[PDB]
Design a protein around this ligand. Structure first.
Ligand SMILES: O=C(Nc1ccc2c(c1)CNC2)c1cc(Cl)ccc1-n1cncn1
Lengths: 39, 156
């Protein structure tokens, strides 16, 4: 049996660690909700 | 039980110890998470019980106690914040500019941040604090890293 525990408020935080890139990927989504790369 | 708005960890005692299987958002008395986290199973909140209300395997989303309430959308150009809630670790905001998943049915935003599978359901936010989608469903690029889609439901 699964359960839930509070982890915090949903708020935007200024001065947060800015990381990560913005790639443009060609993808397909199947009937099982799984993404895949198209090339 | 506890229905206060906020981000929650989805835990299980089925495996060894207590294992975090995912994360979810509580908003307007409805718990929102990804389908692959719970598989549509009932959840527990202290003594209370949360029953599934709506779900879909293709969208990879499920709502508890009521219909999906999250309807904010990415604007196509601004930076967003992933409010990542990792297993055994404190909730943490990571600002990023999302990329694009191009599909046969249109374009979806995509955050390129790598987190453990138990982080699935962590909400992606806009500058107003509104939940624009959930992190946890995407693809594994040539690098071995994970790039998640910004998965958003539909508000009836
Ligand atoms: O497993 C993940 N996501 C997922 C799992 C099962 C299903 C779906 C998505 C949608 N249809 C069922 C995952 C999630 C995160 Cl946050 C980081 C990595 C991840 N992965 C690593 N390998 C592969 N996915």
């Amino acid at each position: 049996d699964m359960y839930i525990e509070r982890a915090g408020d949903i708020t935007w935080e200024k001065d947060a660690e800015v990381t990560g890139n913005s790639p443009r990927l060609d993808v397909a989504l199947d009937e099982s909700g799984d993404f895949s790369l198209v090339e | 039980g506890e229905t206060t708005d906020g981000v929650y960890r989805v835990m299980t005692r089925r495996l060894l110890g207590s294992t975090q299987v995912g994360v979810g958002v509580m908003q307007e008395g409805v718990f929102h998470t990804m389908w692959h986290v719970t598989k549509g199973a009932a959840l527990r909140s202290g003594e209370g019980r949360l029953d599934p209300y709506w779900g879909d395997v293709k969208q990879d989303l499920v709502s508890y106690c009521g219909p999906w309430k999250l309807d904010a959308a990415w604007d196509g150009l601004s930076e967003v914040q992933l409010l990542a809630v990792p297993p055994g670790e404190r909730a943490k905001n990571i600002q990023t500019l999302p990329g694009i998943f191009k599909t046969k049915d249109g374009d979806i935003g995509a955050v390129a941040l790598d987190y453990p599978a138990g982080t699935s359901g962590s909400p992606i936010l806009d500058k107003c604090g509104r939940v624009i989608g959930l992190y946890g469903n995407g693809v594994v690029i040539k690098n071995g890293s994970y790039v998640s889609a910004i998965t958003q439901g539909k508000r009836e």
